[PDB]
From a paper:
Here, we show that TSSC4 directly interacts with the SNRNP200 RNA helicase and the PRPF8 spliceosomal scaffold, and present a high-resolution cryogenic electron microscopy (cryoEM) structure of TSSC4 in complex with the helicase region of SNRNP200 and the Jab1/MPN (Jab1) domain of PRPF8. Subsequent addition of PRPF8Jab1ΔC yielded a ternary SNRNP200HR–PRPF8Jab1ΔC–TSSC4 complex. We determined a cryoEM structure of this ternary complex at a nominal resolution of 3.05 Å. The cryoEM map unequivocally revealed four short regions in the C-terminal half of TSSC4 that contact PRPF8Jab1ΔC or SNRNP200HR, consistent with our interaction assays. TSSC4 region 1 (residues 153–168) lies along one flank of PRPF8Jab1ΔC, with aromatic and hydrophobic residues of TSSC4 (Y155, W162, Y165, L167) engaging in stacking, cation-π and hydrophobic interactions with PRPF8 residues. Region 2 (residues 198–220) interacts predominantly with the WH domain of the SNRNP200 CC via a mixture of aromatic stacking (F201 to SNRNP200 H1502, Y1761), hydrogen bonding/salt bridge (N202, Q203, R212 to SNRNP200 R1762, D1753, D1753/Q1749, respectively) and hydrophobic interactions (F215 to SNRNP200 K1748, V1789, M1808). Region 3 (residues 253–263) comes to rest in a groove formed between the WH, HB and IG domains of the SNRNP200 CC, where it engages in hydrophobic (V255, L257, L260 to SNRNP200 I2079, I1818/I2079, I1818/Y1821, respectively) and hydrogen bond contacts (H259 to SNRNP200 D1928). Finally, region 4 (residues 303–318) occupies a shallow groove between the HLH and IG domains of the CC Sec63 module, forming cation-π interactions (F304, R312 to SNRNP200 R1993, F1983, respectively), salt bridges (H305, R310, R316 to SNRNP200 E2045, E2044, E1944, respectively), hydrogen bonds (R312 to SNRNP200 S1981) and aromatic stacking interactions (H314, F315 to SNRNP200 Y2021, F1983, respectively).
Residue numbers in the entry:
A (entry chain J): 2071 to 2320
B (entry chain T): 153 to 168, 198 to 220, 253 to 263, 303 to 318
C (entry chain B): 403 to 2127
Write the structure that this text describes.
Amino acid sequence: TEWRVRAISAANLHLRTNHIYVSSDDIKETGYTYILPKNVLKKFICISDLRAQIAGYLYGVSPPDNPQVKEIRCIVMVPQWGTHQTVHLPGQLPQHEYLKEMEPLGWIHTQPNESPQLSPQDVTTHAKIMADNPSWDGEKTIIITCSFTPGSCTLTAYKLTPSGYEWGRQNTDKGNNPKGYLPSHYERVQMLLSDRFLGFFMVPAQSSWNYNFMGVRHDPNMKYELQLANPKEFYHEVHRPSHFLNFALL
Amino acid sequence: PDYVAHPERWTKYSLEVSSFNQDPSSCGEGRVIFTKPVRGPVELAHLAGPGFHGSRKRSRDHFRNK
Amino acid sequence: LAPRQVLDLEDLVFTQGSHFMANKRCQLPDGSFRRQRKGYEEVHVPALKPKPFGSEEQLLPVEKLPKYAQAGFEGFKTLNRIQSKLYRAALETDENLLLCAPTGAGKTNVALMCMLREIGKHINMDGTINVDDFKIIYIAPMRSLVQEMVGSFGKRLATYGITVAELTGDHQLCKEEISATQIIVCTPEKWDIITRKGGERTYTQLVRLIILDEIHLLHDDRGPVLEALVARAIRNIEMTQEDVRLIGLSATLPNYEDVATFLRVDPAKGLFYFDNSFRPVPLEQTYVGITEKKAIKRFQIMNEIVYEKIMEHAGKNQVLVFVHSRKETGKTARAIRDMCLEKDTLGLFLREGSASTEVLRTEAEQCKNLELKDLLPYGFAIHHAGMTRVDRTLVEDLFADKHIQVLVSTATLAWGVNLPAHTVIIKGTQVYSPEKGRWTELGALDILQMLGRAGRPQYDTKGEGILITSHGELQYYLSLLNQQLPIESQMVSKLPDMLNAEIVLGNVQNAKDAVNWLGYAYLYIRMLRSPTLYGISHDDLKGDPLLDQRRLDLVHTAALMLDKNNLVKYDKKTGNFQVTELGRIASHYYITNDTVQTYNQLLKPTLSEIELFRVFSLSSEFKNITVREEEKLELQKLLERVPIPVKESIEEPSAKINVLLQAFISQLKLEGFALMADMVYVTQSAGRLMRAIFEIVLNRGWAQLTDKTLNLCKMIDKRMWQSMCPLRQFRKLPEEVVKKIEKKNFPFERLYDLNHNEIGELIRMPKMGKTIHKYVHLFPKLELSVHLQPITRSTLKVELTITPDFQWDEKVHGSSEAFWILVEDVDSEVILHHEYFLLKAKYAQDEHLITFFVPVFEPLPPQYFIRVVSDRWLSCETQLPVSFRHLILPEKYPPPTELLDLQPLPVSALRNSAFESLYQDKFPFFNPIQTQVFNTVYNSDDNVFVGAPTGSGKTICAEFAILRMLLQSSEGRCVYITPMEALAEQVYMDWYEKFQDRLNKKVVLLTGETSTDLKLLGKGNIIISTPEKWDILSRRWKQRKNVQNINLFVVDEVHLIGGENGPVLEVICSRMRYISSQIERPIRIVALSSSLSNAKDVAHWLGCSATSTFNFHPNVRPVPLELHIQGFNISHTQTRLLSMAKPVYHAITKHSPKKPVIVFVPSRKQTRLTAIDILTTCAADIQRQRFLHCTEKDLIPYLEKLSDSTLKETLLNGVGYLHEGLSPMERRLVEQLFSSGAIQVVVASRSLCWGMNVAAHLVIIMDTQYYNGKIHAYVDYPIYDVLQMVGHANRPLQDDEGRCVIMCQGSKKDFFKKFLYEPLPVESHLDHCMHDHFNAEIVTKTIENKQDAVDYLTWTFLYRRMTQNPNYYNLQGISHRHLSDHLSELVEQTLSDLEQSKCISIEDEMDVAPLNLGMIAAYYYINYTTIELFSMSLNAKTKVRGLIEIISNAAEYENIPIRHHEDNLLRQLAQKVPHKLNNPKFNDPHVKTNLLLQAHLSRMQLSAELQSDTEEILSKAIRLIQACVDVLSSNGWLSPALAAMELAQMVTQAMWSKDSYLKQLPHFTSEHIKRCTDKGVESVFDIMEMEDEERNALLQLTDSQIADVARFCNRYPNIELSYEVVDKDSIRSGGPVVVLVQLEREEEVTGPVIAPLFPQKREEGWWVVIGDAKSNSLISIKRLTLQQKAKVKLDFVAPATGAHNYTLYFMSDAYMGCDQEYKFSVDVK
């Protein structure tokens, strides 16, 4: 029942937005380059938690000039619940009118501790999403990990090689060290934060994205409908109605 | 903290053709041409343009008085 | 200014507060034997002997009282001694009264007598009373006393029909209920809050009497509230100069003369002081102070003292016990009973009177569960305000009837109910004060009130009041009760807050004003009469007799304290105060400055719920609240389980108050006596504190914190968390039912779809399904629709349509529901715009439209969010995202034309000397704009567009063009177009002397009539006209050659093309361009406009080249403009105007003290109100007559010609005012006075901005809004009107600058900031009004097919603007395909509507031809909707009653104003009019027009506003009736046509058909007609034939009267009609028949018709009609004008065969009784 301590800690999450470091200089120049607006990143960090991972699907479009740059125009929050190692998301991919023009570009998630490698749980999740829905191209989708460090948050991006995609779908182990996991599976893509344009959010209608507290009401086969509205923070009152109701019972 | 160890790898971010005055005789591009949007027995002639002088007592009884 | 010193307030603050005593030595009364008990010292004083009656001291009975005041006194035979002595003062005079009487005297009767006098000076003769003409305010210390007084006064005054209600508590935005009642009873702080709100003025407008009950509370800590209230009342009395009576009922204490001075009470005539001897029941009071300090032994000693004292009275008495705790009453009762049982075995049968009798009575009533069951069998009983239910109202009855022997009660009984007892004992005297945080000595006032009940007034002769307290330092009660405790002032402690409240209210604006205000405070009087106690030395007092230095030091210290907290910006140099919004909020919500500083420091845009609760806990209101060790266990228990975690704060007070607030919101219960008390205290504070925090964050623009604070406010109000089911807000639903819904984790939104059966199944209770389904739709819910169109590249015009979607219940929702409209950016982090939306029950279920402007920045946001949040209901909001995906921003406008620095052109630049003579007197040189334009506008001949700010002198450029035209062509003709008729008249008046006189060139002004317009255009060199007149003149341009050949066409104020009536201007300008293209002799176009951003579009539209386009920036005006904008964050319009009243005078003094000022107000009434307010404000200051610069002896000749009394009175003081009600002569006289400089200030209505021909140094605009009756809302001024008002603020000759101050609602401020300083963007609205112009073009054969209409659309300005700003016109792209598709759709939509109304005929989907309806609509210049309605409604048997209703339904009258409160007057008029309309909506222009037309026909006299509206209606009535005549004659219906002709002729003469024809004659009355009728005179012909002497004897005559009557008779038509049928014998079936009729008048008179009542000028028009009355068929009709001779022939087809009978009718549209009728027969062969 340390949710109170965690909420007190997460209340001071805007401070980390004052400084953000982005990995670079390790990426091969060949391939796509992804550009993330600052406002959606700041909001995503603000609505996150220090010990529970959250995730959001990325939708974007290439600028008309060149197709080697991907502009992430939107972030979609879906009914989800996460541990400190992985995020559980519904099987259904988000579907909405505004998403027709924008192609999926992968997903972005936070993690408590910065790690040099890419989490095998993340690799498995990405590979399984690829296998389930063919709308996700093998080379056009990326995993953006926003790891939390003392002071600031360190963004980095990864993509899956064909060998990694093959391994992930057949991987069943969910431990820290699965069988036959090697760094050749993933690769680093180039990502830049830019404030020259603004993105938006889409959140589930008739409900909220966070299901960490009412986890029993979350099923992988659940269906949802999106709406155009900014998400609420992790410890918002609507996310934990049991805490408010039980206290009244007291 | 890899950012302090290898600052070169990481990058710090603050994060805060028309035609006017048409007439029936016109041609060429820019001419706005209309296209379907595919969504009185009595004649009024005037329409469409063309003290105490003590006068003699009137004959009367040809007035309304009602 | 004077030197200012800083004095520590805490040094001069009386620390003891209400416990401070200045009596020092206390002289005991005559009987003062002291009985020490070795445990508690006792002091005894005897009852005072009543004062013997003096001479003529008989008690005055009700019979001697005034008869009107006898009612409300039933139950009393004669007044008491004190009441009788004050009878004269209360009833025979209005002197302010200060009553000092012993407690229990009965001052309530004196107050009632004063109220009766106030009512009796509102008797209203036959009417019972003037209930709505006055108001009385009652101020009482305790709310229980408030309720008691409300009940008593209601019972007394129910005979007078006056309702008295109490408004005390947390009421905010009080409803009309306060306006409904006349006597308001409340607590001092409650009234103080209401006054601080700034809405007090609309309440106290009728207030004439305020009663300050228990004004001896000044010594207490709440004294400063009373001091502030009294000082504010006195200052308002002096300012408004309205006498308001102040009556204070005080206890007998020293320094009462200081209070009498403080109350403006004359010591000789208003001060009444009665010592304790005058008490109706003298009492023997005993005081018991416990010497021992042992807390454990303290209660034992106190109980023993109570018991021994009670046992003395035994049972043959009645003992009342007072305690100060709800639970301590039962404790005391049970302890006393038990100790009587155990100590001496004293049985309770002693209490019971006469053994078993009446024991059954209490035994029968013993069946209660409020612990009375334990005590009711005996004499004991309890009575507490809290948790008593109905047991209170029954224990009161039982004790009143002398059955309960011992009654222990809380102090609330002393105020709530008047049940006297023989002896009263007060226990403890300690009360736990949560704000103090400890136990404190209770208020002296409450002790006095509850000790004033000793001894029944009727059944007792002696009283015994025993007061038990501590022996140490608590014997000062002797000074209190023995008339020895002086009243002291505590205002020093709360001086900064009182000063800040005054500063916010505007009563003070500088250290001088604050020093003057401090004089009315009781503290100043106390310092005068007792300097030593307040730290003032005698030397300082003698060297400063008025204590000016001390008062200024106090003012400076308070100002420094306020400035430190950033509440008031105060500069030491000038000693001036500036009000900050933080200070305004602090004053409105009654929070201390320390709390404000804490909030200002702590509040951040990123605060969460935890930090928000912590910030609330850190308020200074709870500084004294500490954490008691005994309650720490339960505090920790609650701390572990909380929904909002508490940041750190293990056991600090902040944690305590935080968890208390959370537990209160969660409706939790606690087991601590003290804990619940401070929980209640923090809740009561939390209401206002959270409201103030929400206001602060909302004003700061933060969005997330605003939402969180609003949710917290609503949760505190409703005592429920947001996560709970919203249905808990309805208190009717059972708790378990809603609990069942909450158990099912099921969203509330989905519950709308389910029906009652499905709901019952889901909740598992089928019975409750119907109630739940009913309550679901009761929940407030709105639907949002947004229409978005971009104005500029940085602003968007948003039109939000709000459609309520819930069933309205007055029980639940109430009179009105409030909503907050919030628009936010993508991140929902900044509130770009916000406003307050008020939904009224009357207008519920109706769509509401809200228009506002929001900015857009360079990175185009994806979308904006619009939120409508309920101000009261939890979980009641609607969010609508406004997508910008498809937005096309307008093109950035090019830079304005640079003002070249050229040496000014001398007037001798005009080569012609005659042209020079026009200006060589006015000025020697032109302003730089004119010099720059001169070459192009004079030497060149091409089209030129001039855009300059108002007052730059564009009229001189127009005159340049006219002079060039005259120079090149002697007979050249110029046309000048001005959108406003007032501007046209002003320009005509100006140019008449310039051209007609000096240059001898004809100048004419166009009028309504077409023939006169044609004559003027033919003989006029310079034509001045409005868009509508020139439109009707130029529609047939293919026929009138004069319209074709005009050398020059000048358009003034072309920027009004955007505003209303813009489409007519656009159409006439486009038609002029089209004519210029055709005629082959170009018509030069000179366009004058304000600074236009998109001047390129207008120049391209009008053919002006880029070199000849002069678009200047607004900062180019010759007289620089200094513009200031002030925002008033008040939603209510009346409250906003009342708050604006004084800032008008303040701005007048600040900006232009000695220079002319013009004030613009919304309405006509507000003009006079503002003039009077300015005069009162100036007279309140020592200036008085400062706005009058000439002697009154100079003014009297001007005032003689005036008629309005109020206007004359105001002008006598130097302030004038203007409105439409004033006669044109009066307005000209006022303008002449203002221009001459006699008066400095004039107040004008907004509708006179164009009309006025005067300039001022300062212009003040008020509220920038006006009520709209049709939409029952307020719509802001058009920007063009604001620009015109600003243009008045310039005097080039004598002013180096022009200043303008705009006062408007806070939201509107940004719009004025954007638009006023920058060039104005103008769009077109021709697309909405396309129908009439298309119909006119079709009739004129300009548009012969559907493609010709799309060609015609290309010439318009709309076509130009569609490319530049497509989204404004609902256009997607700017491609040729998009534009062509949109134009084709628009023209097809318009032509389909035209064909649906049978106005035109569409053949083969391409060709269009006109029809009769369109023809007549074009001929009479009438909207096509109106002619369609005429065609539909008119049938073959409509009468005049139907005709009037049809006419009043015309679209021309849709714009008739519906002003405020006109509904009552119209409803009253509705009974008077003959033809009553069924189901009248009085907020409907058509009903108003019908009523006004009927009144005009009935010659009824009514208000000036309604007369002004009647003139406007009669302006169009004639053309509408002629159109109806043509419509009826078209179908062939005879009788309706004749009825319509008679309707026209009787509207002209303003009489009904039944009225005798003599009503037309001037100076004729009902008796005049009666005398003629008896003689036999029935028609106007008779008097003309009657002899001069003979007719003179019939009626009374005067020279003027008979002269006018004869003049009318000469004008009366004497036409003779002779008709001829051509070839009567030879008429063939179906062959044409020619009927030739010749008519000629013998009189041969000239001139217009004589219609006195009809406003405009009418020329008589006749209707020769042939028809068959038998078959009601109109065969033919021919309209003509006589012109003293005429020869009219009309023809028709002979029907069938045989002899036919026809009736030739001759009718008139001007007079009555001149209509002729002939019958002829024809034969068909």
